[PDB]
Amino acid sequence: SLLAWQKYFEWTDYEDLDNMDAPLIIKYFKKFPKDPLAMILYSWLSSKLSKYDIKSLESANIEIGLLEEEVVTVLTENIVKCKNNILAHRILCQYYLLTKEYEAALPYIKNGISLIAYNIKDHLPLTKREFSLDLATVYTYVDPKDHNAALKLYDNILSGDFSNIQAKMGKGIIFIERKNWKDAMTLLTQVHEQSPNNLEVLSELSWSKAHMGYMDEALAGLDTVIKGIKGMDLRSIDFRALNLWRQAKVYIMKHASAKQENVKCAFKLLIQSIKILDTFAPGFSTLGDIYCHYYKDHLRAFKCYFKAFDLDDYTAAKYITETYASKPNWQAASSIASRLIKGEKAKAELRSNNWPFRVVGIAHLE
């Protein structure tokens, strides 16, 4: 009946939603297309993000943007109608964080944790662990205010499970962003030993190795990452751009310790990344860094930094403000400094350097 199938679907816990019996979903949707959970599952299957292939099953039975109108509309309708469904909340949260929707997913993750607490008070931890991972990722990405809470959650997850590499890589990310690499090398080496196949895992391992000590195979580590992508999605494109930027960065880092082949190679890699991305601000930032430091050119570095700052950035803003202030042109320098201050994306570097406030004050004085 409808009730039995609904209860079975709600109680059938999946380690990953992609392993669900897709022909069973087809059968249930054919039987009861009106069920909100049924249409949510149908939208999940129809989404390009899932591992399912609806066309093959039925036969057997460039712009920037990722979300789908039909899926968003159906999920919004279902969440407005039901207000209580573990599977619906899980699917909605998964779609949120996969569509790079962290802030919008916070109330829904809160509702899901409330529902899981309801179920606990009324006890498979397979769904609770997934929801905790989702909340920890939301804390890590959206918020340096909730970083410590996410780190504590990762520590608890690793202590209680010690079987998920996602928590390990999240803790590695938190350690990397806080310049705490000593544990990062150990964690990345352990993960790579567990499975030396994840391209991103090899990317972070080579990154951490290159940042101190070993630089020989650090460059070659990303080679198997860049060569093995063969991707066409927006996520694939930006991942390739990120890998190219990482290889260029570690490459000039190794070049730090007359020779110009290294600079030329990094220039070529960054040019390729900018060509394949056309909005990749770190590429312009690194190009401006190279132009200012090594090639000793003025206009090219200024243009690269201007593009990087317009797209995004302390160093680019400082370079442009110094270029304006030396002309002098205090209105444009005031505009750049005021934009940097109001952005609130560089408040950490503004607690030690006081040139933006001085620039704004001087421009008012003039």
Binding site: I271, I274, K275, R300, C304
Partner: peptide, 12 residues
Amino acid sequence: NADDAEIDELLP
């Protein structure tokens, strides 16, 4: 150079 040319062709 080819590099500078490509850079100029990608921007203003």
